[PDB]
Design a protein around this motif. Sequence first.
Motif, PDB file in Angstrom:
ATOM      1  N   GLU D 131      11.274  10.401   8.478  1.00 11.33           N
ATOM      2  CA  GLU D 131      11.014  11.204   9.666  1.00 11.33           C
ATOM      3  C   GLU D 131       9.602  10.914  10.160  1.00 11.33           C
ATOM      4  N   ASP D 132       9.489  10.435  11.401  1.00 15.45           N
ATOM      5  CA  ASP D 132       8.178  10.075  11.929  1.00 15.45           C
ATOM      6  C   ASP D 132       7.337  11.294  12.279  1.00 15.45           C
ATOM      7  N   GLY D 133       7.953  12.467  12.399  1.00 14.10           N
ATOM      8  CA  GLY D 133       7.218  13.678  12.700  1.00 14.10           C
ATOM      9  C   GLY D 133       7.544  14.271  14.054  1.00 14.10           C
TER      10      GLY D 133
ATOM     11  N   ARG E 126       9.325  17.293  -8.412  1.00 11.51           N
ATOM     12  CA  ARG E 126       8.799  16.421  -7.365  1.00 11.51           C
ATOM     13  C   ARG E 126       9.403  15.020  -7.285  1.00 11.51           C
ATOM     14  N   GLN E 127       9.277  14.217  -8.346  1.00 15.38           N
ATOM     15  CA  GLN E 127       9.583  12.794  -8.231  1.00 15.38           C
ATOM     16  C   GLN E 127      10.598  12.288  -9.248  1.00 15.38           C
ATOM     17  N   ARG E 162       8.411   9.945 -14.843  1.00 14.14           N
ATOM     18  CA  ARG E 162       8.265   9.242 -13.570  1.00 14.14           C
ATOM     19  C   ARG E 162       8.668   7.775 -13.689  1.00 14.14           C
ATOM     20  N   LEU E 166      11.858   5.808 -12.031  1.00 13.89           N
ATOM     21  CA  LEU E 166      11.661   4.622 -11.201  1.00 13.89           C
ATOM     22  C   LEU E 166      12.469   3.440 -11.725  1.00 13.89           C
TER      23      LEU E 166
ATOM     24  N   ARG F 122       1.514  16.915   6.021  1.00 14.21           N
ATOM     25  CA  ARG F 122       2.469  16.145   5.229  1.00 14.21           C
ATOM     26  C   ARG F 122       3.137  15.057   6.064  1.00 14.21           C
ATOM     27  N   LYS F 123       3.546  15.385   7.291  1.00 12.51           N
ATOM     28  CA  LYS F 123       4.096  14.364   8.177  1.00 12.51           C
ATOM     29  C   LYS F 123       3.074  13.271   8.453  1.00 12.51           C
ATOM     30  N   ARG F 126       2.941  11.084   5.118  1.00  8.24           N
ATOM     31  CA  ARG F 126       4.344  10.845   4.787  1.00  8.24           C
ATOM     32  C   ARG F 126       4.610  10.073   3.496  1.00  8.24           C
ATOM     33  N   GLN F 127       4.128   8.831   3.392  1.00 10.56           N
ATOM     34  CA  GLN F 127       4.580   7.955   2.315  1.00 10.56           C
ATOM     35  C   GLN F 127       3.455   7.369   1.471  1.00 10.56           C
ATOM     36  N   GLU F 130       1.291  12.256  -2.626  1.00 17.93           N
ATOM     37  CA  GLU F 130       2.206  13.274  -3.116  1.00 17.93           C
ATOM     38  C   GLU F 130       1.490  14.615  -3.183  1.00 17.93           C
ATOM     39  N   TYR F 140      -2.734   8.650  -3.747  1.00 14.16           N
ATOM     40  CA  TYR F 140      -2.494   7.659  -4.788  1.00 14.16           C
ATOM     41  C   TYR F 140      -3.397   6.438  -4.679  1.00 14.16           C
ATOM     42  N   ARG F 162       0.991   1.666   3.199  1.00 16.10           N
ATOM     43  CA  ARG F 162       2.320   1.818   2.610  1.00 16.10           C
ATOM     44  C   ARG F 162       2.555   0.812   1.487  1.00 16.10           C
ATOM     45  N   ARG F 169       2.297   2.260  -7.205  1.00 13.90           N
ATOM     46  CA  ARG F 169       3.280   3.075  -7.910  1.00 13.90           C
ATOM     47  C   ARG F 169       4.215   2.234  -8.770  1.00 13.90           C
ATOM     48  N   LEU F 170       4.499   0.995  -8.362  1.00 11.94           N
ATOM     49  CA  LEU F 170       5.375   0.143  -9.159  1.00 11.94           C
ATOM     50  C   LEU F 170       4.654  -0.405 -10.385  1.00 11.94           C
TER      51      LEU F 170
END
Lengths: 48, 222, 222, 171, 171, 171, 108, 211
Positions: D131-133, E126-127, E162, E166, F122-123, F126-127, F130, F140, F162, F169-170
Motif C-alpha cells: 500500500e503506497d499510502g 510481528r514477523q 525470525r 525466513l 508507518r506508511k 513502509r518497508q 519494524e 534496520y 529497500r 535482513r537476509l
Amino acid sequence: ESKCFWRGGSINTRLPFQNLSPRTVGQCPKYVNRRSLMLATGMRNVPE
Amino acid sequence: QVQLLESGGGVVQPGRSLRLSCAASGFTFSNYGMHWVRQAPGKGLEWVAIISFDGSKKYYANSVKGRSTISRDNSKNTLSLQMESLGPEDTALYYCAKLPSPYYFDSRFVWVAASAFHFWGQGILVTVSSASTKGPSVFPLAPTAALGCLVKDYFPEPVTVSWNSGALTSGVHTFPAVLQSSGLYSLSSVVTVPSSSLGTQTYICNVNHKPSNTKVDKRVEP
Amino acid sequence: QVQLLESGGGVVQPGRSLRLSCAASGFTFSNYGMHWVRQAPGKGLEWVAIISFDGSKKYYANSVKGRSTISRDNSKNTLSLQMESLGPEDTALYYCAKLPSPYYFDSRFVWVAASAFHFWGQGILVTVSSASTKGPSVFPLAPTAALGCLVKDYFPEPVTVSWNSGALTSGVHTFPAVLQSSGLYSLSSVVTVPSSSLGTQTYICNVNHKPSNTKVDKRVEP
Amino acid sequence: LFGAIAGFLENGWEGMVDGWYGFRHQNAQGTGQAADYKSTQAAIDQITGKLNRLVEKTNTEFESIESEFSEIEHQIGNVINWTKDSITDIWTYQAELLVAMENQHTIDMADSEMLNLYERVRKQLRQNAEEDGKGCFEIYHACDDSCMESIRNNTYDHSQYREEALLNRLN
Amino acid sequence: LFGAIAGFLENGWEGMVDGWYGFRHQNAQGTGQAADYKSTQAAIDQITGKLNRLVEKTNTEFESIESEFSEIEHQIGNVINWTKDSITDIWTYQAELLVAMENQHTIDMADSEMLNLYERVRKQLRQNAEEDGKGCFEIYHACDDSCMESIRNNTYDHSQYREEALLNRLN
Amino acid sequence: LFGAIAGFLENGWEGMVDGWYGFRHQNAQGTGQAADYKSTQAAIDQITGKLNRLVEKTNTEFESIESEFSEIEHQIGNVINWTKDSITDIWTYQAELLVAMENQHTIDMADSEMLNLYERVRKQLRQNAEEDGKGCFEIYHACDDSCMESIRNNTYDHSQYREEALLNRLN
Amino acid sequence: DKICLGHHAVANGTIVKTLTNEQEEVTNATETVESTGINRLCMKGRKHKDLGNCHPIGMLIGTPACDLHLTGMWDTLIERENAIAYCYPGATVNVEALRQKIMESGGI
Amino acid sequence: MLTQPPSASGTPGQRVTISCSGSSSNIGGNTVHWFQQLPGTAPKLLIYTNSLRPSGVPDRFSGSKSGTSASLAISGLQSEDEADYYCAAWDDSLNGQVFGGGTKLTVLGQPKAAPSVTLFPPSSEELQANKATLVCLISDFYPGAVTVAWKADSSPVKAETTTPSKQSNNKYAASSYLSLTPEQWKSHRSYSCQVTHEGSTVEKTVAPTEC
Ligand SMILES: *[C@@H]1O[C@H](CO)[C@@H](O)[C@H](O)[C@H]1NC(C)=O
Ligand SMILES: *[C@@H]1O[C@H](CO)[C@@H](O)[C@H](O)[C@H]1NC(C)=O
C-alpha cells in the motif's frame, strides 16, 4: 387531513422541530427558535 | 400519487407468448429499479425478474431463466415483460412493483431517504388453457335471513360482484370460486338481513365479467 | 487591557535605516508570538515578518528577506524591527500585532483556550523621500448649508482635524489627501448645518500635525 | 476520526457515482471502475435506520391553556410565558446537540466503514502487494480484470502469487 | 464500527465462557482454549463504571402541588397538567437518547477493545506469522502450549524464530 | 478507545513541551526531539472549535415571575417552585451528560489523532523498518537527522533503502 | 498494474454543523427544522363544528348568534375572533375556566 | 498570493458572500482568517480557524472553507457594517501569512436627494499665499457616479475628494478644489460648477463672483 393546528393553520410534517409558533395544539413537533438545523446524510465532501 | 395502468391481460393459449406492460405516474420513474413477481392461484410467491434503472443487468430467476425477458423505458415510464412457451406453471397473477432492492438498482437520489417508496398496485391474472371463453350464468338465491346470487359456468375468472351498484357492503360474503369437471368455475355471494323485510326492499345483485364484456343484474324475491 | 505604545515614526530619507519598536501591556507578553505587517498607502496588505515567543526562527518574507530584522525582548515586553535601504516600496503603515499563527509560535498556556487574543492597535506610517518637512497652511471655507477648513502644502501627512476641540462629530466629512506637483498634499474637511445660524455660533476647526509640532485653529464667518 | 476520509485520501472521486466506496484500477488492459456492495449497503442501512428511528414520534396530545381572543390574568399569563419559553429553550438546545452529534457520528461512521473495507481488501492482498499510502495498492506482479472482480468477490488467493511476488522482490 | 466483532469475525464462540476475548489454538498436542485477562477486565471495569455513574441520583425533594381528594381550579389544573406532560415528554426523549447512545457506545467499545487486543497480539507475533483474516493467525513454524502461554503472558520473542520463519518462507 | 494513548504507549513524555505528538530519536549523532505540526494543529483546531460552539449563547430574555419583597399566593408559588426545580434538575442532568460525553470524546479524539499520525509515519516507513510495539520504530539500517526531518516533512523515500534493508535482513 | 481507493463527492456540497466543525461539507443533506405551514384548517376525517359568530358561552346561555349551536356533537370545536357571547351586555365569572371546559368538550 | 475579488454588493439583510481561493501552498491544508477594516479606523478580527469568531463579533457573521477555497458570509448586515474586508491565510512553502487582495463593499443605497451643493469662493487670506482655490462640494448623495465640469468664463479647464459611505445613512460626499496662481485666478470673472449626476434631471449650476 391533519393532526396539528395553531393560530395560522395546520402543520403536516414528519420533522421533529418547527419554528412557526410555540403555541400549538394536538400531536405537534416541538417549537425551536433556531432558524435552520441541517442533519448530515453523507460523508466529508473532498473536492478535486 | 399512487396511480397506475396495466395492460396485457386476457386469455392466451398454451405455447404462445404473453406480453405484459405496466406504466406508473405520480413520481420519477427513471430512477426506481422495478421488479416482476408472480403468484400462483391460491398462495405461494415466486419472484420472476429484476431490472436496473438503466437496464444494465437482468439476472433472471432460474425457474424462467433464458425463457422470459424484462425491459423498461424511462421516457414513457413503462415496464414490459415478454414470455414464451406458456405452460400450466405460468398461470398466475403477475405484479410489477418497486421493492427494497440493492442500492445500485436504484438511483443515488433516493439512497439518502427513509421514505421507502412502496407499491404493488394491482394484478394481471394470466391464464393459459384451451381458451373457450364462456359467459356467466346467474341464478338468484332467494328464501334473521339471507339472500344471494350464484354465478356459474364461465371462463376465465376475473369476476366481480356488487350489491346495488356497490352500495351495500355490510354483512356481505363473497365466496371463492369452485372449478368443476367441465373446465368451468362457480361462485356464490350472499348478504344477511333481519327477518322483517321480505317483500319490502329492492335487492339487486350485479356481476361484471371482463374477458367476455358481460354485465348481469338480478333481483331477489320470495 | 488593550493599551500599547509605539515609537520609531518620523521622516527618514531613502537609503538610511528605519527602526520601529512597539511595547504592549495588560497581558503576559512573554508567550504570544508577534507579527510585523505592512500596508502600502491606499489598500493592499503585505506581511513582513514573524517571530517566535523565544526567538528561535524568523522566516522572513521574500519581499524583504535578508534585508530586515525582527527581534523581541520578553523582559521589557518589547518588539523591534530594523530595516535598511529604504526604497519607495517601503513607505507604508507598519502594524505590530498578534495574529492567529502556528501553535509553537505561541506558548502551551494559550493553546487550550477559545479567547483568541486580538490586537493590531495603531499604525506607524513610515515615509521615505527628500524630507522637506513643511508646515501646513489652513484656509477657512466660509459661505441648509455647510462650512469647512482646507489644509494644504505640508509634509508628511499624519494630520488630524477636529471641530471645537473634538466635540461636533455629526454631519462632518473629512476627505482624503491629494498630492500635487510640488511634493505637497492637501485635505478638506467640512461640516453641515441648517441655514438658520450664519452669524450665531462659534465654529472653530483645529488641525494637528505631528512631525512639525503644528497646532492651528481657525474660525468661520460669512 | 480515522485517517481514511480526512486522512491519507486527499481527494474524493466525484466521477464515482457507482457507490460510496469503490475501486479504480489501471492495468495493461486500461482503466476501469467498480463499486463495493457490502460497505455501501451497510452505510445506507445504518443511515436509513437512523432516519427511521428519528422520524417516528407519537407526540402525546396537548390542548390550549392560553386564550387567543380574550385577556388572561397577568400573573398566570406571565407564568405560562415563562414556562413555555423555558421549554422552547430546552428543546432548542437538545435539537442543536442531537443534530451536531448525529452529523459527527454519521461522518465518522462513513469513515470507519471506509477503513474497514480498506482492511478487508488488505487482508485479501496480504502478501502479494504493498500500500503506497494514498489509498492505492502497488501490485508487484499483476492483476487481471477477472483478478479485480475476484478482489471484489472476496475470492483472491495469495498463495497462488506468493512465490512469484517473493521472486520478483528478491531479484 | 470496527471490523472485528461485526467485521471479519463472522462467528462468535458460545463455548468460550472463560471471558469475552480469549484464544483458541490447535497444535500438534491438540486443541486448547484460554482467555485474556486484560481486555476482559478493562471492558468489565468500564461497564461497571458506567453503571455506577448511572445508578446514583440524589433526586431533589419534591412535594404535592395537585390535590388528590378535592377539585382544583380548572385553569391552574390545566396549566399543571400541561407542565407535567411536557416534563414527561422531555424526560422520555432524554431517556430514549441516553439508552440508545449508551448501548451503541458499549457495543463499539467492546469492539474497540477486541481490536486493541488483536493489535497487541499482532505486535507480539510481528514477523513470525501471518493473519489469515478470519481472526486466526497462520503460524508458519510452530507454537507450543508454553509458547501459547507466552503469547498470553505477553512474553513471546520474535527474534528467536525470525531466521527460522525466513528460511521456511524462502525455501 | 484506541490502543495508542491508553494502550501500547505505557508512558507519557512530560519533557516534550514542543507539542502533543512529537518524535524522539536516538542515532549515532545522539538524542534529539521534535514535534509534528499537523496532528497538534488538528487537535488544537478541533478543541477550539468545540469551545467556540460551546461558549456562544443568545440566552433569550426572561423576566421576574416571583416577587422578592412581598408574599405570593401559596398555590401559584408552589407551582412556580415545582416548575423551577424541575427545570433546574433537567439542566443539571443535561450539563452532566454534556460534560461527560465531551470529555470522553476529546480524550478519544486525541487518541485517534495519535494513531492516525502513527499510521502516517508507518506508511512512510513502509518497508525499511519494524515497529517494536512500544511506540518506537526499530530502524534496520540507519536514519540521519536530515532523514529524521524528511520523516517529519513526509518526504522519506523507501525505495532508496529497500534493497539495503532486504540485504541486511537476509544476511 | 495499480488499483486505488477513494470516496465520492459532489460539486455543490451541503454545509452541516457538528461538535468539532461549525461548517462541514457533506453530500445532499436534509433539513430538520420546518419553516412553512398550510394556511388552512384540514378537517377531513374530523367532525368539525364552526361556531362562526357564536361564542362558547352563548351555547350554554342561548344567545341568538348561537341558535345554530345550542346542542350537537363534535370531535373538534372551532372558535372565531368575532365570537359574540352577549346580546345583552354583561360579563361572566371565571369565564376562562368555562371557555376551556367548553372547548375541551365534544358535545352539549 | 491569494485571489482578489475586489468588490461585492448587496442590500441590508441579503446575506452577501465573498470568496477567497488559493492553492495547496496557502489554503490547504491550512487555516484562513478574516478581518474587518472600518473606513478611517483600525481593523478588527472577525474569523479565525475558518469558522471561529472572537468576542466582539455578532453571530450574523460567518466563515467557511470548501477544499481549496474559502468564503465569508454576512447574514444580518445593516448600515453600520459598510467597511473593508480582507482575506488572510498561512502559506506552507512561504513560511509566513500570505493575504488576499481585499474587498470594498457598499450597500444598495436608495437614491437620496440631490447633494447639498454649496459653492465656496476663496477667502481673502487664501489669495495672500500666491495661490487660489475655488471649492464646490456636494455631500449626502448616492451613488458615487458623478461628473463635475468647471467653467472658467464658460470655458473648461485641463489638469477632487470623496469619502466612503456613512455609518448611519450610506451618504457619499464629494468636493473639488480648483487651484491656480494669482495671475491665473484674477484673469477670469465668473466661475461655476456643473454636475451630471444620475440623481438629477438637468445640470445644476452654482456660481460665485469676485467681490
Ligand atoms: C436531495 O435528495 C432528496 C431526496 O433524497 C431530494 O428531495 C432533494 O431535492 C435533494 N436536494 C438536493 C439539493 O440535491
Ligand atoms: C490553565 O490554562 C489557562 C489558560 O489556558 C489559565 O487561565 C489557567 O490558570 C491554567 N490553570 C492551570 C491550573 O494551569
